[PDB]
Each structure stands twice: as C-alpha cells, then as structure tokens.
Structure 1
Amino acid sequence: RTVARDITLLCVGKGRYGEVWRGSWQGENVAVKIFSSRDEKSWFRETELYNTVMLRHENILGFIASDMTSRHSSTQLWLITHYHEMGSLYDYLQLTTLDTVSCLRIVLSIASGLAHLHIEIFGGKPAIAHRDLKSKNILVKKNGQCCIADLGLAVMHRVGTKRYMAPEVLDETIQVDCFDSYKRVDIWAFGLVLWEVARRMVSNGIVEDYKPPFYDVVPNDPSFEDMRKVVCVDQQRPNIPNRWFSDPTLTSLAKLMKECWYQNPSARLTALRIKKTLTKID
C-alpha cells in the first residue's frame, strides 16, 4: 500500500509556541502546528492524551495526526488537525457583532465541548481539564458552533495564560492533588470567555467593542502580580454594563458569568449545569 504523507504548507499564526499553517492533504485543508523546541512538552502532552483516548466531539478541534521527524541536528514536531477557515473566536469577535441566536449557539457549543472534556465515561474516556481555556484557543466553525483547541497543558484523571488564571492559581492555594480543582480553574476561564462573547451581542441597538478580560485594570501581557492584585487582593470581576439588564438573554448570561467567578472554587457551576442553564435561555 502507498501511504501518502506529503502535506503542502500553504501561515495563519506565529508565536513563542511555534507556528500554525493552513496545509493541504489529498485536496483537503488541514491545520499544521509546528512546535518550537521551547514548547516540545505541549506536543508530548497532547500526543500522550490522544494515545490514551481518541477524543471525537463536534466541539473539540478534530485530531488527524501527531508527527515526529528526525532532522540533521534536531527533531521536528507537528500536530495536524481539522482546519477552521473562520479562525479563532478572538479573531471573529473583533470583526463581527452577534444576535441572540448566534451568541447562545457559540457559548452553548463551548460549554458542550468543555463538559465533554470534564466528564469521565467508563468502558469511554478519562476526565480531562484543559488548563488554558481562552478565546484564542476556541475556533469558529461555518455552522456557527465553536470547538476547543490546544490540549498541550491538559491533565487526565508552560503555565496557563495569566489574564485568564483563577484566583486559587494566582494565590497558589489551588489543591494541586485534587482533579476537581482543575475543572474549577476551567470554569473561571469559561466565565471570562462568556463575558467576551456577550459584549458583542447587540441589544436595543447597543454593543460593546471587543475587549479582553480585565482590559481596564491590567496592562498588555499582565504580570502574575498584576493579576493577583486584581483578582485575589481587590477581588475585581469584569464589568456588567447596564444595557445588559434591558435584555433577558444578557441578564441570564450575566448571572451565569457571576456563578463561574466565585472566589471559592467549589461554589462555581459545573460545565453540565452551565449547559442546562444555556438550554433554558430563550
């Protein structure tokens, strides 16, 4: 048998992590993440996870392959996935406003992907916590649902992006031996993503501009201390604009956000309870 492995690289992202390319395999678009040597452990962790459980879910970025190739004086590490031409939710929210149906569809699809990660299924999958959930790690699909990407920090039962760190991460009180601690860190981050999306939902002719969480209280590339002072010491939370309280959908989403942001991690809603709440909105 011939095994056609050639991928043509046709660049949609570049960072410290490495690069992401739009590629072609057998006439089909794929996404190719090429890891920097600095972030090899992210390739190893995602690969170890997919070797343990082949996740398949409409709201999880679809795995195609993990490739290690020997070079001259180095190892090349590629992760190949489904390609989502609309790009990340972070991207999408800058150039689009949302109606009620499109806002709910986005956030319920993210909750669905997250609840799938979190749930242990016997026979199935281990429970999984993401540990770096944010709008840049969510892709928009043509059908209006999203999918969650980047399991390089995931844990089965590098640090997370500081802007999205839960208070117990910033004050180093997280119970590191307790798997449920990691789910609760994801729920905090989910709540910040819900806030990012809800701002872009139009009501009564009003919308907020795209901003990242805590844009008004921390610098770009905020330090660990900058975040700890805001979230732990002062106990600040993202602003809920008055205009949301004229709209029943945004009023319900504001309540949901609040229940993801309790200082006490064990008070936070579960991903399954968030899904249920979202199915009863509208």
Structure 2
Amino acid sequence: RTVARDITLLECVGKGRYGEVWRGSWQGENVAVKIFSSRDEKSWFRETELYNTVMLRHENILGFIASDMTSTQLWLITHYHEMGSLYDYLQLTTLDTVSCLRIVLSIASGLAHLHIEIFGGKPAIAHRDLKSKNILVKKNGQCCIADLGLAVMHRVGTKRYMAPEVLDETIQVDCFDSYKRVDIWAFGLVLWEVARRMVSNGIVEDYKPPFYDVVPNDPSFEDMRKVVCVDQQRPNIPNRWFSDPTLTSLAKLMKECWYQNPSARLTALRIKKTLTKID
C-alpha cells in the first residue's frame, strides 16, 4: 500500500521567532503546518513528547495530525482554522452577548480539559503560553487553544501575559498547581481582551492588548515586573460594563483570575461552572 505523505504548502499565514505557519493541503483536506525555527527546536520535542504520551482530542484544543522530522526540518501538522487567531478576529469584529459567551466558554472548556487529570484518560497539563494569538476561531463560533510547545504534564511564555509570580520569580517551580494558576492569570487577560469587543448599549472598546496603556510594544521583563508586581496594576474595567449584566459578571470573573496570591485565583473547572450560569 502507498503512504501519501505529499503535504502541499500553499500560503504562509504566520512568521515569527517560532518559525512559520503555512496553510497546506494533504489529500484534498486543508492542514496547518508549523515549521519550527532552530531557536524553537525544544518546543517541537516538548510537544511531540506530550502527544506521544497522550493523544489529546477535544473540540476546544487544536487537533493534532502529525509531528515530522526530515533530513533537520521539524514540522507540526494540525487542523486548519480559516478564520484564524482570536487576536486577528478581535481586531476587525465586535461581538454580542451570544458570540462573546460562546468564545469565552469554549476557551474555559479547552483549558479545563487541559488542566483536569482523567483516570482510565489523560495527565493534567498546564499550557504556560495562553494568549489571544494562541487561540483560533472555528466557524461554529467556538475557539480552540493552540501551541503546547511549553506545556507541562503531571521565565518562559509571552512577557505581556506572565503572572506576577513568574515575573518576580516567586513561583513554586516544584508544584504543578503553580503552572495551572499561571494559566488562569493569562485566561483572565484574554477574557478582558474579548469583553472589550462585546457591544452593550451601542458602546464597544477598540481592540487593545493587555497593559497597552502602561508598557511599550515588546515590553521588557523589567517593564512588566514594575507594572504587575511592584505597582500591582491590573487592566481597566470601563464604566459601561457595569450597565451590562454579562460584562458585570465577566469583570468579577477576570478580577478572580488576577489576584497577586496564586492560590486565591479561581480554577478552570470553577470558571467553566460560573460561565454556564451567565445568560
């Protein structure tokens, strides 16, 4: 029998320090192909090792197809999501109560699935690089979490999204729950980025990245540590949110993701429960 391994690379949909992502084709079907830079080689090994241990299958987790090493090119092949990243989608799109709640509930579902140990099954997983660029929008209005390059099974990540215990290096490195709590911090920021683009009473905010008003682009560790750890600043909740019951509930939720004390933050399971009681 023949093994069709011809993956056609059609257009580049992303370039960065990580390498490149390509819309590709395998046997008619659209696939996404990540070509790892030498800089990010370790991420391919971490992610391949994870999927060699547990084959994750969840509607809110970017779907694995293949990990390939060729003579050295390192490739990750996934399902393709033509709508692109939540980051990209939020720039050009506003949301209503239904689309906003569908997006944030699907992210919480995907994250709770990563975090939970299932017996029989999967180990518990912390993502450690959650951000709006690492979330993709599906045609059914749900999202999926992508990029398990830094994932841990039971510092690193995007500086703008790092929890204060990461920035001030007080994180208990030998405690798995520490890495879950770092994920909730970043989830709280993503929730803020999405809520801003939900219309209420004819009002919406601009797309802005977290801490857009207090740090430059490509903020330094020191920039982030001063804002988040020393000054203990948190993203602004606009007045207009408190005229909307959904945005009022989401504001309370994001505050409970942003405590300086990691152990005080909500769990993914508790956020999922709270979000189902909202509308």
Band of TM-score, shorter chain: over 0.9
- Is 1:136 matched with 2:139? no
| Residues 139-169 of structure 1: per-residue CA shift (max 9 Å, x gap) | 0000000000000000000811000000000
| Residues 31-77 of structure 1: per-residue CA shift (max 9 Å, x gap) | 000001110000000000000000000000000000000xxxx6000
| Kept after mapping to 2: 8 A contact 1:39/1:158 | no
| Kept after mapping to 2: 8 A contact 1:134/1:190 | yes
Q: Distance in 2 between matches of 1:123 and 1:230?
A: 44
| Kept after mapping to 1: 8 A contact 2:155/2:167 | no
| Residues 113-156 of structure 1: per-residue CA shift (max 9 Å, x gap) | 00000000112000000000000000000000000000000000
| Kept after mapping to 1: 8 A contact 2:136/2:144 | yes
1:260 is paired with a residue of what secondary structure? coil
| Kept after mapping to 1: 8 A contact 2:31/2:79 | yes
- Is 1:212 matched with 2:213? no
1:12 is paired with a residue of what secondary structure? strand
What is the TM-score with the length of structure 2 in the denominator? 0.99
- What's the counterpart of residue 9 of structure 1? 9
Q: Structure 2: any 5+ residue segments left out of the alignment?
A: none
Q: Distance in 1 between matches of 2:37 and 2:272?
A: 36
1:94 is paired with a residue of what secondary structure? helix
Q: Structure 1: any 5+ residue segments left out of the alignment?
A: none
- Is 1:146 matched with 2:147? no
| Kept after mapping to 2: 8 A contact 1:187/1:270 | yes
Q: Distance in 1 between matches of 2:40 and 2:112?
A: 27
| Kept after mapping to 2: 8 A contact 1:214/1:238 | yes
Q: Distance in 2 between matches of 1:161 and 1:145?
A: 24
- What's the counterpart of residue 53 of structure 1? 54
| Kept after mapping to 1: 8 A contact 2:188/2:258 | yes
Q: 1:160 to 1:194 in 2, by over 3 A?
A: same
| Residues 155-211 of structure 1: per-residue CA shift (max 9 Å, x gap) | 000811000000000110000000000000000000000000000000000000000
Q: Distance in 1 between matches of 2:148 and 2:43?
A: 8
Given the alignment, which residue of 102, 123, 126 partners 2:123?
Answer: 126
Q: Distance in 2 between matches of 1:35 and 1:256?
A: 36
| Kept after mapping to 2: 8 A contact 1:115/1:271 | yes
| Kept after mapping to 1: 8 A contact 2:160/2:211 | yes
- What's the counterpart of residue 248 of structure 2? 251
Consecutive aligned runs of 4 or more in structure 1 exceeding 2 Å deviation = none
| Kept after mapping to 1: 8 A contact 2:155/2:166 | no
Q: Distance in 2 between matches of 1:179 and 1:39?
A: 23
Q: Distance in 2 between matches of 1:78 and 1:25?
A: 14
What is the TM-score with the length of structure 1 in the denominator? 0.98
Q: Distance in 2 between matches of 1:47 and 1:168?
A: 28
| Kept after mapping to 2: 8 A contact 1:188/1:261 | yes
| Kept after mapping to 2: 8 A contact 1:120/1:126 | yes
| Kept after mapping to 2: 8 A contact 1:43/1:77 | yes
| Residues 19-42 of structure 1: per-residue CA shift (max 9 Å, x gap) | 000000000000000001110000
Q: Alignment RMSD, CA only?
A: 0.7
Greater Cα offset, 201-210 or 153-162: 153-162
- What's the counterpart of residue 265 of structure 2? 268
Fraction of identical pairs, as percent: 100
